[PDB]
């Protein structure tokens, strides 16, 4: 058996001094980065004046010669939406290959009227891109109804002439501006004109982010074929005068990442070498483009091997991009310059600012990292660029600097920095095709500055160029935007960033409007911190901490208030390798479980008397302890629960966030009148063995309740460690007792007489057993024992033909197979619109086969084991039933090493109907169904019809589809254009409805209120909206003479928070919404007319319909209802026939309540959140029925960066 | 339609244009249920007309109109209310229902 | 444009014929001007050959 973590994440090579200096700068505070850059970028006053004069001259020439789309908009008086819609139409018309066929469709069909009749795919799929072209603004989703109206309007107003102009404009832009040509041969033909003027070219075949082996092979052969064409055309001109190629490493391997570094070196490197050998033979440049920040250092390992490879010697065409917006840039340059010296290769170094700025900000915030790997003020990037240019210009004997910029100030500064001694081959400038030529036509040539410029020339079809055109077009801080803004003076454009930064009060301060990841929530609480698994220092330190964690003697014992108790002891084995003993658990006898509840009951007053602020301080101290102990906690979670390192980090972060969130919610709400329930039994699942465990216990404790913590039998060790941390943080032993063991221990705790509440997260079937146990029980006040039961899902994602396949596949692979599908939120049913289903399925299967399944103590493992052999057997029985029915089943092949553990390969099962699924299958099993677009509403019904309602995803660019689907789906956590596994505490408050939960949501503001006898008013919890049926009922009550009930009804209408609609603070590039809706149909079990009126008021005020128990005999109390109220009212003689219900209100004495609670628990389907009150309580207490539990929380997380950029961050420079 | 509003001119021609800004992303849910019912019974042309009406309806439009500072001037499209339907044929009734339901009305 | 330039004269007629104060006569003429310009602009935004008159 291999030692745990002995091969966790070894670096490709030992890190040299120069490499270590790169890693050390990865997230260096911005105030530390800038001073040396300012120093290196400083030039003499004479140079700065000459640079400003040159920049002004260039800018004056630019503004003096400065429209195609603008001219079209002007000529036809188009609104912006009309312009966008026209270009979308033109794009669609250009998908018709034959010109005569297109023109006939235009003249005879499109112009004459209904364009919709002649053009499965919305015309407006790419409207966000065309919106950027027309308006300069990015909108993440497309208002397809506005665009359709605008297209109809413009065609009916202007006819064929405007369509013709739009088609011709789109053809020119997509064929000649956004690309140099559609094919390398066309691009080469079009390059002769500017080559004759002194420009050169680097061709970009536009490949990027391979998702499958086949994609990577396609991009390879595209690069190889382009190299031949470019090399034939170069015809011996060499690497400086002649054209070259640019490649992206992500195009050449589907798993280009540090986590897969061994595959990258073994599989990607030979492909680059083969392309480089061909470039060498033709003597052309081959440049490696720079991508995301977490790929920088990995790419250096390839650059190192290639430059040291003797087979490539004699050729100086290898090139490499460095991004000056990155904090590591000067250190990367030091490394490259030294590599060039060692290898004797004159590396072509393209200095750029960087293309992924918005995404880098979002990623660092999502990952909770210490700082950004890029600057946050645009001027810092400018200074970085100029400083790095000074470094490169001192090294022209050993590297060939290539200054890629469209900024005339940047250009002029470097032109003068480089001085008057010039020869071709010393350095060059670079620019983008169809963007930089106006500037560089003022640079290239003896009559200008006599400096060469290489044009970066995209080559590809319409489909290829549109894929990432949004990123290429992206902002208010951009020079090209500012040059076209008449409000920006030339003096502003020639401002010297070096001197501006030098004079700032704090040199290098972070942008004021960009939150560090730790500060995402501002004053409310400190965000949990993650770990950067692309940072070699982090990987090396984590390796040691993980190894050290595997040497610890982890145990879990029955920790009663009186001390550890004896019991049956057994080992805890790693699910990925049963030979790896992780620790030992001593399980709780049912007698000691009952004893623990009695001890908790005796201890309840002493814990309730700890003021809420001090209880919250215990939670905050526990969060600090968990944060500090994260590396050790990761190792335990990895080995005990089959989690990968990434998933263990998320697990610990979630626990920290629960602690800090419930602490803050406590400080916002809890006072002397919110008395604790008493002893709370917290029963938790194995699959989030620290986060959910900690969340339930922390909430119960901070609400003033002593806790009996019963962790899942599979994962007691991390639970014991969480309890140890909470106790260290100040939770007394009497307030927090750990009771390891199986469901018998949970059941014994639930049945214990002093148990005052139950928090259960687990399977729906077990929750139903607990519901049955509790139906026997009443509190000493004669009321139901509160149960929070957060249960399973049958989670769907709907994908339409406007979604980007690569994005869908990434989110599907993550949502379905992360943690081997052992997340309650995991994607179970992918629903693909028929027109795109085959393409997406092919890509998905290709991506599936790139996953590494194995024991999770290796960073390269993507999918770990299932938790037990029983879980494996259950999942495999489902897979085989499906296979036996003829369903197509795609499965990864498992390595022989998996035999020592319990693994199920990620599996894709193609289904006929959603009804082919019965219950949740908690494993790595994705089901795929196809749907026709017109059946989308029926499909949403089918998703709802399972009775589950946990997570739901939708991938579409179309606002109409978003509005339709999100208004009709019934699930607690919705996700738009992203994965469906988000449960970021306080950002996506998590929890579902139906068979998926009773609520309230964990990680949301209603949670703590369920754990006290009188619920506080949560922060932000109110609504100005009044349910109109409630209002009609109140008027009906007054007309009946029920004056006090009418007043109570009006009060309920005001007190209801139905209609609350909030945006929760979170990361950039996402909108996280939280809304309160009706629950559905509430079962009313009244005893008296006044009780019925109060129950109906409560239910109607919260937007619900009702089914009233017909056995109450109260039919005559509801005569002559207004039709609006009658529509919401039904009478039920057989409650089981008239469900599912979404809650219940009960009136009666204690024994009536007990009997009704038993009858309600017997109803099929979802657990019902029941509220009961006596008739006297209804008379005495206006809040006898709490409106908090009569609404349903919905969280929706929208990825607003999905179109390729962040609109809001375009204004942050 | 309202004088001084964007629907007015369309009443004065025999085929109404699509007014500026006249659209809505919202689809009436009863319209949606009606279209599913039509498809269930095989009325394919009518179900298509129903879906098309659901999309072209501007019910739910909710705009702020440009005006003076210190004022918010809002313009919204709601259902008319209850529409009297006087059909002659089954298909005609289905088309009338589609139009009325798509615009949020009862009939 | 003509109503705008002739507003003072039009005001005088409205004041005397319809019993309006000067401020409300101004509002009357402004509203007429705005109708003219609004329906002109709405026309430029919408009307094409297939929108035949009644
Ligand atoms: C020929 C060529 C090849 C290129 N190849 C690559 C490549 O392989 N990889 C890559 O990542 N980029 C590459 N780029 C650069 C990238 O695509 C942009 O074109 C470039 O960053 C724009 O810089 P500028 O001098 O043209 O414009 P400017 O207007 O001077 O600078 C804009 C840049 O400033 C930066 N920026 C904007 N806001 C902020 C902020 N708030 N804080 C910090 N920085 C900010 C960004 O880098 C932004 O792109 C290339 C550019 C060219 C011209
Ligand atoms: N809605 C959510 O937030 C959420 C979160 C995580 C997991 N889940 C669900 O949890 C399930 C997986 O976790 P699991 O396998 O540990 O679930 P489970 O239902 O098997 O076990 C959950 C817990 O209940 C205990 N238990 C078992 N039988 C009991 C009984 N008769 N009485 C009292 N307690 C009993 C177990 O010991 C364990 O502690 C999945 O169905 C998943 O969807 C839901
Ligand atoms: C548009 O200029 C770019 C060239 C290459 C890259 C590689 O990421 C990005 C931008
Ligand atoms: C609708 O035309 C109007 C003209 C003037 C006023 C102000 O009196 C109001 C309306
Ligand atoms: Mg179980």
For residues A1019 and A1005, the answer to whether their CB atoms sit within 8 Å is yes
Using H for helix, E for strand and C for coil, what is the string for A986-1008?
CCCCECCCHHHECCCCECCCCCH
For residues A453 and A429, the answer to whether their CB atoms sit within 8 Å is yes
Tell me how close the Cα of A149 comes to any Cα of chain B, in angstroms: 6
Peptide bond into C31 cis (omega under 30): no
Q: How many CB atoms lie within 10 A of CB A190?
A: 18
Distance CA A173, CA A165 (A): 12
Strands A286-288 and A244-247: parallel
Residue A788: both structure tokens together: 């929070």
Strands A925-931 and A907-910: parallel
Q: Is A17 annotated as a binding residue?
A: no
C52 reaches B (C-beta below 8 A) = yes
Element (H, E) at A833: strand A827-833
For residues A645 and A861, the answer to whether their CB atoms sit within 8 Å is no
Residue A1160: both structure tokens together: 């309600």
CA of A112: which chain C residue's CA is closest?
A: C50
For residues A352 and A323, the answer to whether their CB atoms sit within 8 Å is yes
Using alpha carbons only, give the angle A174, A178, A180 rounded to the nearest 5 degrees. 95
Coil/strand/helix, residue A531? coil
C35 reaches B (C-beta below 8 A) = yes
Q: What is the dihedral of CA A1012, A1014, A1020, A1024, to 10 degrees?
A: 150
Residue A823: both structure tokens together: 């997340």
For residue A393, what is the DSSP state?
H
Using alpha carbons only, give the angle B42, B43, B48 rounded to the nearest 5 degrees. 120
CB-based contact C45 B10, cutoff 8 Å: no
A727 reaches C (C-beta below 8 A) = no
Give phi and psi for A738, each to the nearest 5: -100, 125
Residue A526: both structure tokens together: 């400190």
Q: Transcribe chain B into DSSP letters.
A: --TTSTTSGGGGBSS----TT---S---HHHHHHHHHHHHTT-HHHHHHHHHHHHH--TT-EEEEP--TT--EEEE-----B-----SSHHHHHHHHHHHHHTT-B-
Coil/strand/helix, residue A53? helix
For residues A618 and A790, the answer to whether their CB atoms sit within 8 Å is no
For residues A942 and A965, the answer to whether their CB atoms sit within 8 Å is no
Tell me how close the Cα of C1 comes to any Cα of chain B, in angstroms: 18
A944 reaches B (C-beta below 8 A) = no
Q: Transcribe A1000-1068 into DSSP letters.
A: PPBTSTTTGGGGBSS----TT---S---HHHHHHHHHHHHTT-HHHHHHHHHHHHH--TT-EEE----T
Active site residue A329: no
Alpha-carbon distances, residue A557 vs A20, A560, A709, A711 (angstroms): 44, 9, 12, 11
Peptide bond into A954 cis (omega under 30): no
For residues A905 and A892, the answer to whether their CB atoms sit within 8 Å is yes
Tell me the resolution in Å.
1.3
Distance CA A225, CA A184 (A): 9
Distance CA A611, CA A598 (A): 23
Q: How many CB atoms lie within 10 A of CB A511?
A: 17
Tell me how close the Cα of B24 comes to any Cα of chain A, in angstroms: 6
Residues of B in contact with A944 (CB under 8 A): none
Ligand 3 binding pocket (C-beta < 6 A) is: A 248, 289, 291, 355, 432, 456, 472
Question: Which ranges of chain C does DSSP label H, i.e. alpha helix?
Answer: 2-5, 7-18, 22-46
Task: Give the residue whose CA is nearest to atom 2 of ligand 4.
Answer: C31
Which residues in chain A (93-152) have CB-CB distances under 8 A to chain C?
113
Residues of B in contact with A938 (CB under 8 A): 36
Residues of A in contact with B17 (CB under 8 A): 153, 156-157
Q: Transcribe A715-771 into DSSP letters.
A: -HHHHHHHHHHHHHTT--TTTEEE----HHHHHHHHH-TT--EEEEES-HHHHHHHH
Distance CA B103, CA B53 (A): 8
**Partners of residue A585 on adjacent β-strands:** A556, A570
Q: How many CB atoms lie within 10 A of CB A845?
A: 16
Q: How many CB atoms lie within 10 A of CB A147?
A: 26
Residue C48: both structure tokens together: 């094409």
C22 reaches A (C-beta below 8 A) = no
Given A536, A640, A664, A790, which residue is catalytic?
Answer: A790
Alpha-carbon distances, residue A460 vs A141, A179, A627 (angstroms): 25, 7, 48
Burial of A572-611, coded b for 16+ CB within 10 Å and e otherwise, reads: bbbbbbeebebbbbbbbbbebbbbbbebbbebbeebbebe
Element (H, E) at A276: helix A269-282
Nearest to A915 by CA among A793, A794, A823: A794
Ligand 1 atom closest to the CA of A479, numbered from 1: 29
- Please enumerate in sequence order all residues whose Cβ is within 8 A of that of A262, keeping only pairs 6 or more positions apart, or say none: A12, A860
User: What strand order describes the sheet that includes A577-586?
Assistant: A554-556, A577-586, A569-574
Q: How many CB atoms lie within 10 A of CB A81?
A: 24
Distance CA A759, CA A702 (A): 14
CA of A117: which chain B residue's CA is closest?
A: B52
Give phi and psi for A1005, each to the nearest 5: -85, -10
Coil/strand/helix, residue A584? strand
At which residue do the structure tokens 């394919």 appear?
B44
The interaxial angle of helices A1089-1101 and A1043-1055, nearest 10 deg, is 20
**Partners of residue B84 on adjacent β-strands:** none
CA-only gyration radius of chain A, Å: 33
**Partners of residue A199 on adjacent β-strands:** A453
Element (H, E) at A102: helix A99-104
Long-range Cβ contacts of A487-494 (<8 Å, 24+ apart):
A490/A56, A490/A59, A490/A60, A490/A63, A493/A55, A493/A59, A493/A408, A493/A409, A494/A52, A494/A55, A494/A56, A494/A59, A494/A408, A494/A409, A494/A412
For residues B36 and A968, the answer to whether their CB atoms sit within 8 Å is no
Alpha-carbon distances, residue B73 vs A76, B4, B62, B64, B77 (angstroms): 29, 13, 11, 6, 14
End-to-end CA distance of chain A: 54
Distance CA A122, CA A1116 (A): 54
Return left, alpha or beta for A756; rule: phi > 0 is left, psi -120 to 50 is alpha, else beta.
Answer: alpha
Residues of A in contact with B39 (CB under 8 A): 934
Nearest to A962 by CA among A1085, A832, A799, A1116: A799
Given A824, A1147, A1192, A1193, which residue is catalytic?
Answer: A824
CA of B58: which chain A residue's CA is closest?
A: A145
Alpha-carbon distances, residue A929 vs A1, A885, A908, A917, A1154 (angstroms): 41, 15, 11, 11, 44
Q: For ligand 2, is residue A689 a contact (CB within 6 Å)?
A: no
Coil/strand/helix, residue A348? strand
User: What strand order describes the sheet that includes A1191-1199?
Assistant: A889-891, A907-910, A925-931, A827-833, A795-799, A951-955, A973-976, A1191-1199, A1070-1078, A1061-1063
Distance CA A545, CA A526 (A): 24
B47 reaches A (C-beta below 8 A) = yes
Q: For ligand 2, is residue A795 a contact (CB within 6 Å)?
A: no
Q: How far is the CA of A372 from the centre of ligand 1 (A)?
A: 16
Active site residue A790: yes
Nearest to A708 by CA among A666, A751, A670: A751
Q: Is A350 annotated as a binding residue?
A: yes
B12 reaches C (C-beta below 8 A) = yes
User: What strand order describes the sheet that includes A1105-1109?
Assistant: A1129-1132, A1105-1109, A1081-1085, A1143-1147, A1170-1173
Mutate to test the interface with B, among C38, C41, C48, C49 (most CBs of B within 10 A): C38
A188: Cα separation from own chain's centroid = 41
Experimental method: X-ray
Alpha-carbon distances, residue A745 vs A589, A681, A726 (angstroms): 7, 10, 21
């Amino acid at each position: 058996a291999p030692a745990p973590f002995a091969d966790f994440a070894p670096p490709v090579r030992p890190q040299s001094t120069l490499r270590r200096a790169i890693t050390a700068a990865y997230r260096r505070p911005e105030t530390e980065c800038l001073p040396p850059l300012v120093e290196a970028a400083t030039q003499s006053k004479e140079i700065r004046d000459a640079a400003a004069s040159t920049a002004r001259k260039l800018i004056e020439a630019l503004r003096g010669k400065h429209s195609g789309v603008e001219g079209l908009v002007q000529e036809y008086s188009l609104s912006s939406q009309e312009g966008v819609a026209l270009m979308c139409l033109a794009e669609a018309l250009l998908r018709i290959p034959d010109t005569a066929t297109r023109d006939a469709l235009i003249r005879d069909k499109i112009a004459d009227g209904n364009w919709k009749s002649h053009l499965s795919r919305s015309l407006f799929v790419n409207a966000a891109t065309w919106g950027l072209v027309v308006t300069g603004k990015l909108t993440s989703t497309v208002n397809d109804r506005s665009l359709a109206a605008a297209l109809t309007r413009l065609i009916s107003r202007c006819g064929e002439p405007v369509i013709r102009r739009g088609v011709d404009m789109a053809m020119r832009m997509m064929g000649e501006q956004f690309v140099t040509g559609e094919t390398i041969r066309e691009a080469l033909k079009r390059s002769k004109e500017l080559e004759e003027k002194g420009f050169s070219y680097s061709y970009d075949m536009l490949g990027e982010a391979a998702t499958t082996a086949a994609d990577a092979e396609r991009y390879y052969r595209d690069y190889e074929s382009a190299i031949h064409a470019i090399g034939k055309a170069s015809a011996g001109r060499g690497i400086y005068e002649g054209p070259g190629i640019s490649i992206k490493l992500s195009a050449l391997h589907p798993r280009y990442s540090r986590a897969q570094a061994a595959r990258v070196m073994g599989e990607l490197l030979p492909r680059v070498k083969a392309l480089a050998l061909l470039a060498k033979n033709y003597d052309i440049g081959l440049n490696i483009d720079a991508e995301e920040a977490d790929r920088l250092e990995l790419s250096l390992d390839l650059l190192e091997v290639l430059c040291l490879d003797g087979d490539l010697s004699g050729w100086n065409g290898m090139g490499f991009v460095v991004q000056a917006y990155g904090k590591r840039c000067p250190f990367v340059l030091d490394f490259i310059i030294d590599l060039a010296r060692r290898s004797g290769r004159r590396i072509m170094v393209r200095l750029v600012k960087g293309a992924y700025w918005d995404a880098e900000i979002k990623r660092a915030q999502l990952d909770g990292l210490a700082d950004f790997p890029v600057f946050t003020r645009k001027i810092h990037t400018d200074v970085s660029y100029i400083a790095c240019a000074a470094k490169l210009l001192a090294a022209t004997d050993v590297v060939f600097p290539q200054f890629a910029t469209h900024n005339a100030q940047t250009l002029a500064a470097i032109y003068h920095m480089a001085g008057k001694d010039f020869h071709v081959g010393k350095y060059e400038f670079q620019c983008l095709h169809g963007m930089g030529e106006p500037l560089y036509e003022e640079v290239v040539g003896r009559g200008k500055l006599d400096r060469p410029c290489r044009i970066y020339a995209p080559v590809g079809t319409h489909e290829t160029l549109l894929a990432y055109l949004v990123r290429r077009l992206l902002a208010n801080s951009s020079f090209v935007h500012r040059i076209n803004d008449p409000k920006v003076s030339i003096d502003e454009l020639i401002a010297d960033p070096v001197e501006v930064v030098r004079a700032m009060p704090v040199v290098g301060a972070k942008h004021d409007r960009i939150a560090l990841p730790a500060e995402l929530f501002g004053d409310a609480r400190t965000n949990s911190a993650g770990l950067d698994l692309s940072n070699e220092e982090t990987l090396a330190s984590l390796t040691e901490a993980l190894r050290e964690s595997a040497a610890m003697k982890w145990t879990a014992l029955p920790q009663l208030a009186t001390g550890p108790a004896a019991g049956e002891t057994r080992t805890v084995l790693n699910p990925g390798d049963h030979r790896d003993v992780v620790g030992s658990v001593t399980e709780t006898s049912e007698e000691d479980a009952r004893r623990a509840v009695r001890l908790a009951a005796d201890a309840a007053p002493d814990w309730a008397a700890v003021p809420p602020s001090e209880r919250a301080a215990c939670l905050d101290r526990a969060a600090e302890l968990m944060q500090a102990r994260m590396p050790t906690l990761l190792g335990l979670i990895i080995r005990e629960a089959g989690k990968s390192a990434l998933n263990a980090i998320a697990e610990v972060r979630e626990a920290i966030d629960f602690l800090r969130y419930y602490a803050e919610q406590t400080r916002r709400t809890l006072g002397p009148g919110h008395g604790p329930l008493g002893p709370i039994v917290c029963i938790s699942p194995w699959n989030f063995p620290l986060a959910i465990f900690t969340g339930q216990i922390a909430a119960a404790l901070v609400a003033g309740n002593p806790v009996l913590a019963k962790p899942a039998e599979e994962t007691p060790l991390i639970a014991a460690e969480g309890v140890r941390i909470l106790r260290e943080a100040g939770i007394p032993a009497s307030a927090l007792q750990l009771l390891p063991g199986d469901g018998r221990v949970g059941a014994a705790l639930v049945a214990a007489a002093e148990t005052a509440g139950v928090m259960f997260t687990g399977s729906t079937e077990v929750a139903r057993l607990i519901q049955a146990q509790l139906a026997d029980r009443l509190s000493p006040a004669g009321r139901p024992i509160p149960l929070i039961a957060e249960t399973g899902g049958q989670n769907a994602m709907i994908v339409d033909s406007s979604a980007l396949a690569e994005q869908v596949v990434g989110d599907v692979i993550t949502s379905a197979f992360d943690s081997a599908g052992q997340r309650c939120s995991a994607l179970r049913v992918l629903c693909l619109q028929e027109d795109v289903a085959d393409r997406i399925l092919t890509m998905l299967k290709g991506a599936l086969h790139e996953l590494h399944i194995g024991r999770t103590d290796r960073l390269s493992v993507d999918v770990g084991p299932v938790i037990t052999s029983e879980a494996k057997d259950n999942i495999e029985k489902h897979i085989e039933r499906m296979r036996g029915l003829g369903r197509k089943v795609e499965q990864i092949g498992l390595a022989s090493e998996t035999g020592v553990g319990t693994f199920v390969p990620p599996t894709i099962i193609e289904l006929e109907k959603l009804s082919d699924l019965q219950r949740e299958v908690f494993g790595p099993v994705l089901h795929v169904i196809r749907y026709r677009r017109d059946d989308l509403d029926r499909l949403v019904d089918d998703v709802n019809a399972t009775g589950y309602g946990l997570t739901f995803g939708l991938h579409t660019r179309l606002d109409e589809t978003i509005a339709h689907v999100t208004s009709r789906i019934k699930a607690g956590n919705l996700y738009i254009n992203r994965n469906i596994i988000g449960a970021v505490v306080g950002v996506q408050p998590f929890g579902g409805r139906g068979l998926s939960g009773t609520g309230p949501k964990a990680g949301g503001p209603l949670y703590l209120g369920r754990l006290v006898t009188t619920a506080p008013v949560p922060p932000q919890h109110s609504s100005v909206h009044t349910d109109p049926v409630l209002l009609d009922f109140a008027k009906w009550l007054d007309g009946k003479g029920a004056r006090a009930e009418a007043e109570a009804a009006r009060n309920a209408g005001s007190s209801s928070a139905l209609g609350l609609d909030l945006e929760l603070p979170g990361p950039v590039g996402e909108r996280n919404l939280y809304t309160l809706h009706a629950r559905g149909r509430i079962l009313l079990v009244p005893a008296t007319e006044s009780g019925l009126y109060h129950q109906l008021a409560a239910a109607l005020a919260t937007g619900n319909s009702v089914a009233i128990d017909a056995a109450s005999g109260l039919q005559a109390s509801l005569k002559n209802l207004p039709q609006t109220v009658g529509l919401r009212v039904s009478w039920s003689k057989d409650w089981a026939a008239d469900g599912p219900f979404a809650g219940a209100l009960v009136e009666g004495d204690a024994e009536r309540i007990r009997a009704v609670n038993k009858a309600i628990a017997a109803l099929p389907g979802p657990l019902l959140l029941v509220q009961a009150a006596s008739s006297g309580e209804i008379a005495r207490n206006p809040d006898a029925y709490c409106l908090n539990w009569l609404v349903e929380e919905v969280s929706a997380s929208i990825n607003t960066a999905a179109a390729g950029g962040n609109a809001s961050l375009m204004a942050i420079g």
